[PDB]
Amino acid sequence: EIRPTIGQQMETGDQRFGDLVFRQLAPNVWQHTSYLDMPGFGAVASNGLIVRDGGRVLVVDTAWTDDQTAQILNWIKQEINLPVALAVVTHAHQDKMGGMDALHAAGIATYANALSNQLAPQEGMVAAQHSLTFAANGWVEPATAPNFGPLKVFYPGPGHTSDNITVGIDGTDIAFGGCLIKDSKAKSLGNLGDADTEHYAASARAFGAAFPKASMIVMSHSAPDSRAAITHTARMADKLR
Ligand SMILES: COc1cccc(OC)c1C(=O)N[C@H](C(=O)O)[C@@H]1N[C@@H](C(=O)O)C(C)(C)S1
Ligand SMILES: [Zn+2]
Ligand SMILES: [Zn+2]
């Protein structure tokens, strides 16, 4: 089994498939986990989501690479056997957008914050094919997110990056914080190289308030946690100001 240097370990309830791990979170929701080997350091796990919505599947975040992302699509075909309608990617970093070309080669419609698409070329990424825009309170403009089914996209403000977005899964008690949110026992906020240290705490709290009844908080580099992940992340971020 895969034992990453950074990221949750494999536990009961995880399925290894190729180089990835998949974990069912709800009857219609799975977490995908992929690993980037860094020289001298070992593997860094990154998580995203797969959601079944009737006769189609929706994806949140790519894997770190195109080949890993193709493996996610192969898991979906094996385990669910339904077409992927769209993917939402949650900011212009490799862990979230590194596999765009695999989605595009598969014919999957891709969506990201307009700002992520504008930043992608600067970050060594390929832009999504569609841009999401947001209201002044963070909620996505619905005409930009057509036919998103249960995915409720919210821009919480600058934090981990200026472009980070989050996704609630309507009809469940799950919300996805991506790299913005760290787990309740984390010692650090991760890579702050692109972060907005002034606004981070408010942005973490705004994610909590956008999805006030989400009890299972999914994030990029830890196992799903309680809402203490949100509150702890904000408390860490209070120290940055
Ligand atoms: C353009 O992106 C990259 C290029 C090369 C290597 C990378 O990660 C090792 C990445 C890249 O995607 N870096 C991200 C980032 O900088 O936020 C990752 N997310 C961080 C986080 O959630 O705190 C991390 C797990 C410490 S690294
Ligand atoms: Zn990032
Ligand atoms: Zn990350």
Curated annotation (Swiss-Prot):
Superkingdom of origin organism: Bacteria
E.C. number: 3.5.2.6
Cofactor note: Binds 2 Zn(2+) ions per subunit.
Keyword field: Antibiotic resistance, Hydrolase, Metal-binding, Periplasm, Plasmid, Signal, Zinc
Pfam families with a match to the protein in the record: Lactamase_B
Known catalytic reactions: a beta-lactam + H2O = a substituted beta-amino acid
Activity regulation behaviour: Inhibits by captopril, thiorphan, dimercaprol and tiopronin. This enzyme is not susceptible to inactivation by the beta-lactamase-blocking agents clavulanic acid.
NAD in keyword set: no
Cofactor entry: Zn(2+)
GO molecular function, one term: zinc ion binding
Subcellular location: Periplasm
PANTHER family: ACYL-COENZYME A THIOESTERASE MBLAC2, METALLO-BETA-LACTAMASE DOMAIN-CONTAINING
Protein name per its UniProtKB record: Metallo-beta-lactamase type 2
